[model samples]
Target: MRKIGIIGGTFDPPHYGHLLIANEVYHALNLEEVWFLPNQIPPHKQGRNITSVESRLQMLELATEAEEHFSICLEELSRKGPSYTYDTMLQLTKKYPDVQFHFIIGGDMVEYLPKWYNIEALLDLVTFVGVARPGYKLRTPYPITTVEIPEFAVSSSLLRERYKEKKTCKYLLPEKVQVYIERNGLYES
Candidate 1:
């Protein structure tokens, strides 16, 4: 059986924080590969201003291209409708019977597990791995495994705001991704 770690997110620009958490979880769990799964239209972020899927996917590719175990998974984006983890995982498990997926989430989301669609069934499908985020508690009613990661004060929203303000996002985002964003002038109002 193969063990895979899945980090699902909007990945508006695919920043360093995302990389760090994935890297940490990858090593800590001794998983075979850590896949960056970008959401097509995250159910939680329905009406929120999100970057184009093309741009987000490109950035994610650029950000994870050089890593050996880091790869992009299009399971969610390849389908229609809002990207639900349960639905995506269901398809993934059916497609790859030998793969044991471990869904990764930020510590902040641990408390919201109960509200997830078909929480019980989703739990049975994949193990949830929660990475520690600064100022967010890891305590949850769910049986999510916790991994302590270095605190990185960076987010897609922050990077977007900086871009809108014509500020530099030098260290927050991957160099290649930053170059791509600057070259294409993305997120600039």
Candidate 2:
């Protein structure tokens, strides 16, 4: 059976920190490939004005262009309604029945696992791979694998703020993404 890692997020704009976490988890868990799944509509923050799905997917493509092991998934984006992890997992499992799916989550999300829709059913579908974040603490009573990576404090919101303020996001995002965002006026509003 193949080992696959799934990194699901809004990815408002893919940044270095996102890539770093994915890379670390990919290596740490010995996953064959890492799929970066940009959510169509994140259920957690439903009312926020998010960039278009096309824009998010394009940025993710640009960010991971050089990485062969990293690929983007249009699963959530293609689905209608709010993006739910359990539904996505079911779709993926149906498509790749022979593969073991590992869902990559941040420590913060894990802390709020009970609030997730169909948490128990979602847990049964895939293995959880929690990545440590700066202020988030993992407190899952369930048996889940975790990997601690070097702190990369960069966030999509921070990158957006930097872009809006005309500040340098030199090391925060990938050079390609930074250039693209500047050229395309992304997250400027």
Candidate 3:
């Protein structure tokens, strides 16, 4: 059986914090591979302006290029409606019958965990790895496994807002991804 770690998100610019958490989760759990799964349009973030799929994919690709185990999973991108982790887990498990999946999520999301569609099914399908972030109170009511990760408080939307003003933002992510965002005009003018 394969042990796979999955981090699913909008990854509008795919930041360093995302990478930091993934790497920590990779070693902490002895995962075979950690996949960066970008949602086509995250159900939680539906009303906002989302980056192009190709752009998000490119940014994540550039960010995880040097890692042997890190790769982009396009399961949600290939789907029709909003990206739901519950369905995504089912899809992956269906595709890889012998594999066990560990999902990576932020600790701050604890409050919203039960509110997710098919929450109970999600809990049954995979182990949730909660990476600690600012505003996280070292807690979880669900059976989520938690770990402290090296990170910053930066956010993709915040980076976008910064770029909207200065035409460029620095130090939030890999230089390559930063260049990708600036090159493609990802956020705004």
36-115 per-residue lDDT for model 3 (tens digits): 99887644455666567777788888999999999889899777666678888998889989888898887768768879
When summed lDDT is taken over every stretch of 10 residues in candidate 3, the lowest stretch is 42-51
lDDT of 1 at 105: 88
By lDDT: ranked, best first? 1, 2, 3
**lDDT of each candidate versus the true structure:** 0.86, 0.84, 0.82
Our model 3 lands, by Cα RMSD against the true structure, at: 3.1
Please estimate how well model 2 matches the true structure, expressed as its whole-model Cα lDDT.
0.84
Predicted candidate 1 versus true structure: per-residue lDDT over 28-55, tens digit per residue: 8999999999887644445655577888
Model 1 scores a TM of: 0.91
Top candidate (lDDT) = 1
For model 2, the superposed segments whose C-alpha errors exceed 4 Å read: 42-49, 133-137
Per-residue lDDT, model 3, residue 121, is 90
Pairs with steric clashes in candidate 1: none
Report the lDDT tens digits of candidate 2 across residue range 13-79: 8889889998999999899999998887644465755677777888899999999999988888887
